[PDB]
């Protein structure tokens, strides 16, 4: 997890002029940047605070109010030094699929580095033996638009020993 300072031009429609701005911008910005990975940034989640909100213009068209909003939002972005704890929501013969608990089932570990009893043989064998720990290793995101996924990870499992569970 990491804070990301962001700047957005948030448009409040004119039937919300009863509510306070810093709340009613926050209700919009959650609908703008939740469950959405930003390229080279990470998976945005929610709104931390609005650090600076500047003055509400109203443009010659819409009649709405457009406030340029500086804020900070918490995002999900592993730092290439994190030993996370997830769950195996799937097993493919090329590599296991781990999922952080109801977070994102999009972390796909390749499996080449654990102890020399390694295969997934399509009958859902986890590992040939001697919560699940994970080492997130690389950042890898692909911008989708191409014509008229997207944070995938590669996840390792070294000689941790795993004293509690094998």
């Amino acid at each position: 997890f990491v804070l990301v300072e962001m700047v957005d031009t948030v448009r409040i429609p004119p039937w919300q002029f009863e509510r306070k701005l810093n709340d009613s911008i926050a209700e919009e910005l959650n609908k703008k940047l939740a469950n959405k990975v930003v390229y080279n940034v990470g998976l945005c989640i929610c709104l931390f605070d609005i650090t600076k909100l500047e003055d509400a213009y109203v443009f010659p068209g819409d009649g709405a109010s457009h406030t340029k909003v500086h804020f900070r939002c918490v995002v999900f972005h592993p730092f290439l030094d994190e030993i996370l704890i997830g769950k195996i929501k799937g097993c493919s013969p090329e590599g296991v699929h781990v999922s952080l608990g109801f977070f994102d089932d999009i972390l796909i570990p390749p499996e080449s580095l654990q102890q020399p009893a390694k295969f997934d043989e399509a009958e859902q064998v986890w590992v040939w033996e001697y919560g699940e720990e994970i080492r997130f290793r690389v950042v890898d995101e692909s911008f989708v638009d191409t014509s008229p996924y997207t944070l995938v990870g590669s996840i390792s499992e070294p000689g941790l020993g795993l004293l509690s569970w094998w």
């Binding site: 804070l3 002029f17 509510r19 306070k20 701005l21 810093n22 931390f48 605070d49 609005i50 650090t51 600076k52 909100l53 500047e54 003055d55 509400a56 213009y57 109203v58 443009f59 010659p60 109010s65 406030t67 900070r72």
Partner: protein, 43 residues
């Protein structure tokens, strides 16, 4: 010439379909709703 013109006056803002800045488009309007640059949270 590589003529970079800005779009001002009225003979271009009418062509481009921008509200001209001569007259009613000189100023601009704000809204007076409840807002403040607030304190953040302790991290």
């Amino acid at each position: 010439f590589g003529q970079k013109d800005s779009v001002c006056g009225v003979s271009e803002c009418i062509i481009m379909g921008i509200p001209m800045n001569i007259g009613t488009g000189l100023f601009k309007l704000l809204h007076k709703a409840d807002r403040d640059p607030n304190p953040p949270k302790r991290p």
